[PDB]
Design a protein around this ligand. Structure first.
Ligand SMILES: NC(=O)c1ccc[n+]([C@@H]2O[C@H](COP(=O)([O-])OP(=O)(O)OC[C@H]3O[C@@H](n4cnc5c(N)ncnc54)[C@H](OP(=O)(O)O)[C@@H]3O)[C@@H](O)[C@H]2O)c1
Ligand SMILES: NC(=O)c1ccc[n+]([C@@H]2O[C@H](COP(=O)([O-])OP(=O)(O)OC[C@H]3O[C@@H](n4cnc5c(N)ncnc54)[C@H](OP(=O)(O)O)[C@@H]3O)[C@@H](O)[C@H]2O)c1
Lengths: 416, 416
């Protein structure tokens, strides 16, 4: 794969030296070509979905795999939105004049070569390629073993567009082979890749962090908690919970654990049990909440200790009764994965304390956890939702793929 | 060492929850106590310098280790200057109102627990402790074997101040044993320290990147190049080079390789030889410049292939004659460590090309490479100069020790 690395570096130099007009032109060509070849991509994705259904995959997994024409138009519109955004290369962050007469400033520059290891989702290839082209980085992709044909067709379209627009061919490339030995080799390829973005579960992150030399921005799994305070509207809270759970339960920002204040559980729990039975969501309750949730129509089973630290990725929910805000904060800190946290309350003090004392990539007050998305947050699209602390955090947009450089212009200045 | 980490985390929570007034009070008390107890620090540093010189340490190394009363007053003034800076915690980076009615914003927050492994330099301890206190981080320091008594006294003073002002004693900790097994043990504590700052030569960074599981911001070694164009003022270039080389040659932002355009080399080289000899600097010339530099009084020796990639850390310079700007850029890319580069020229186009095409943490036009400092760049003080690309680059100020967090407020908002 060393030839891939050298090609990526050679293309990255020229990309960093490009102008905004050429990048916008290539993005427009990519979007137009995506719209033109809808039939091929749709047929390949349908065939792949039919193949995956033979293995008895989960309904949520199939929904993630599925690609309707509406979704294709959505990804095309996202590419166009990225095109309409301002180019973040060359922008001045700040500047000034020092005491010695030196004119100093900070200017944004690209990062170099970016490696991406993503899950089985079709659109992610498009978004990553568009963001990397707009910013000025060469990208090496390694997708999941399921979406082989869809990723093949999409990367073929992207590379055809790159060739037609005159950009170097090594700007964007992908690894077709699904063997994980090549994944290890990519991880060891330190002299070429400048930064690696793994998206996936615990196993991929474990293996990567074990055997990585490149800087890593871990996508991380998401255990998102929702805290229900004593003073809250029942109907609105139920609507928010239903939206945060039912809609697309296969994502990573879907709520997984529900923390209910003990002074409200006498009234909130029964209604919830009525609502979940409508959506068919199984309730993994604690011992304290089991007695109240037993009479509810919705099916309820006792929870286990290890279930608090993993994602259900289905129509399941953890119900726990806490004593006060301090207990909820302690539980979130202990079991949370620092992805997204929400509080439903009517107290200004409680909302302020929750916002202050909870460390996460995103904290919401009277809102659903499903807002942790690149498109929703105002950015054109996202490459991954970083849960670490270094470099970017939360959704990673155009500015998350760029670094900065100090430039100082003087007149034969000498440091005193 | 685990108890050290537990104390660090427990102190980090409370420190992140503090206010600006308390941190400023602690810093002012620290500076006052440093000025009050100058005698003990001076005695310890003098004894350490005597012991080091008894081992035949280099003159530049001894100058780095030496701490005069003027230097002590300077570090006290820098601590006070930091105390006078604005607290970066809580600042709003940006924000807005989204389409769905959700008010989004970004707020700065402390990183957490910070581990520092640094060279033998007395002032770095105080600077790191002050910055970590001001930001709201807990710090674990592990200094060089030389600075033992000085670091012991300074850490005693800081711990006493923290105890007196009521802050938890676990905020600032240091390791006294110079064994490197403890260094490895600190390296292996991933879940407890949040970010590591190693300062040192290639050996320390190699060992850290070999067996580290914590995010690392490498200080890195510094090979700083200066390119002399065809048309330039001889006297001004000479004085800038003299300032960049002679003054404090033991630092890391000192010029090592001098690139001279062949068109000007017929006249620039002799004058340089007349000046450099007055400074007593040996010239490790290349083959092309060997004939011209021989007549000059300055000492000249043939350069070796490996000398281009290592710092002299003394009064030594590398003279290489290049063809044009493209050759200089290629050489800088090949051999540079991406620390600080400068160009002395009278052409606007050449300056623009050099600024655009050279990838370094700092690029200067008609200036010196000695400006790559935390204090010079307007920041109060720096913990290290980062030569990597992730997180901060160049000097690391107050904001380099803080990350950000998304906050979203809504009225039971639902994602559409
Ligand atoms: N944090 C974020 O921004 C974000 C975004 C999207 C998804 N996610 C997470 O994605 C997870 C589900 O992803 P998934 O359904 O695709 O399953 P997964 O097992 O998490 O996917 C792992 C990814 O890496 C590969 N992989 C798996 N095991 C590997 C190993 N041992 N060595 C090398 N590569 C390996 C997989 O392809 P192969 O199996 O073919 O090797 C796949 O591309 C959820 O937990 C969710 O939280 C997070
Ligand atoms: N990039 C920057 O911002 C920056 C700033 C300052 C200095 N520097 C660099 O500092 C260098 C000189 O530093 P120096 O004179 O102190 O020498 P050094 O050998 O670079 O110092 C290494 C530092 O780490 C320790 N260390 C050395 N070998 C180690 C090992 N195998 N395992 C663990 N710890 C180890 C040393 O103390 P022990 O030997 O007792 O272990 C010392 O604290 C220059 O090359 C300069 O460029 C860079």
């Amino acid at each position: 794969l060393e030839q891939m690395g050298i090609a990526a570096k050679q293309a990255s130099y020229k990309l960093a030296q490009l102008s905004s007009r050429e990048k916008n032109r290539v993005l427009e060509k990519i979007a137009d070509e995506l719209e033109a070849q809808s039939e091929i991509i749709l047929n390949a994705n349908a065939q792949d979905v039919a193949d995956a259904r033979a293995n008895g995959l989960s309904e949520a997994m199939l929904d993630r795999l599925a690609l309707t024409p509406a979704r294709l138009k959505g990804i095309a519109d996202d590419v166009r939105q990225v095109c309409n955004l301002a180019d973040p290369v060359g922008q001045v962050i700040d500047g000034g004049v020092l005491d010695s007469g030196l004119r100093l400033e900070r200017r944004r520059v690209p990062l170099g070569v970016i490696g991406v290891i993503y899950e089985a989702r079709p659109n992610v290839t498009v978004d990553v390629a568009s963001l990397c082209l707009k910013t000025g980085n060469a990208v090496i992709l390694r997708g999941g073993k399921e979406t082989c044909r869809t990723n093949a067709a999409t990367v073929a379209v992207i590379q055809d567009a790159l060739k037609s627009c005159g950009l170097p061919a090594g700007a964007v490339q992908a690894i077709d082979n699904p063997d994980r030995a090549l994944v290890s080799e990519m991880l060891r390829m330190d002299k070429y890749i400048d930064m690696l973005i793994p998206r996936g579960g615990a196993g991929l992150h474990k293996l990567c962090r074990e055997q990585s030399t490149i800087p890593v921005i871990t996508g991380g799994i998401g255990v998102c908690h929702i805290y229900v305070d004593e003073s809250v509207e029942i109907a609105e809270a139920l609507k928010v919970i239903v939206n945060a759970k039912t809609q697309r339960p296969s994502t990573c920002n879907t709520v997984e654990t529900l923390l209910v204040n003990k002074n409200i559980a006498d009234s909130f729990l029964p209604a919830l049990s009525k609502q979940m039975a409508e959506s068919g969501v199984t309730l993994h309750a604690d011992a304290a909440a089991l007695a109240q949730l037993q009479a509810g129509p919705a099916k309820v089973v006792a929870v286990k200790a290890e279930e608090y630290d993993d994602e259900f990725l289905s129509l399941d929910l953890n119900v726990k009764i806490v004593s006060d805000l301090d207990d909820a904060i302690a539980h979130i800190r202990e079991h949370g994965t620092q992805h997204s946290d929400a509080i439903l309350t009517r107290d200004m003090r409680n909302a302020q304390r929750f916002v202050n004392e909870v460390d996460s990539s995103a904290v919401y007050v009277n809102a659903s956890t499903r807002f942790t998305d690149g498109g929703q947050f105002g950015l054109g699209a996202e490459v991954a939702v970083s849960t670490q602390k270094l470099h970017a955090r939360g959704p990673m947009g155009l500015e998350a793929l760029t670094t900065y450089k100090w430039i100082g212009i003087g007149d034969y200045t000498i440091r005193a």
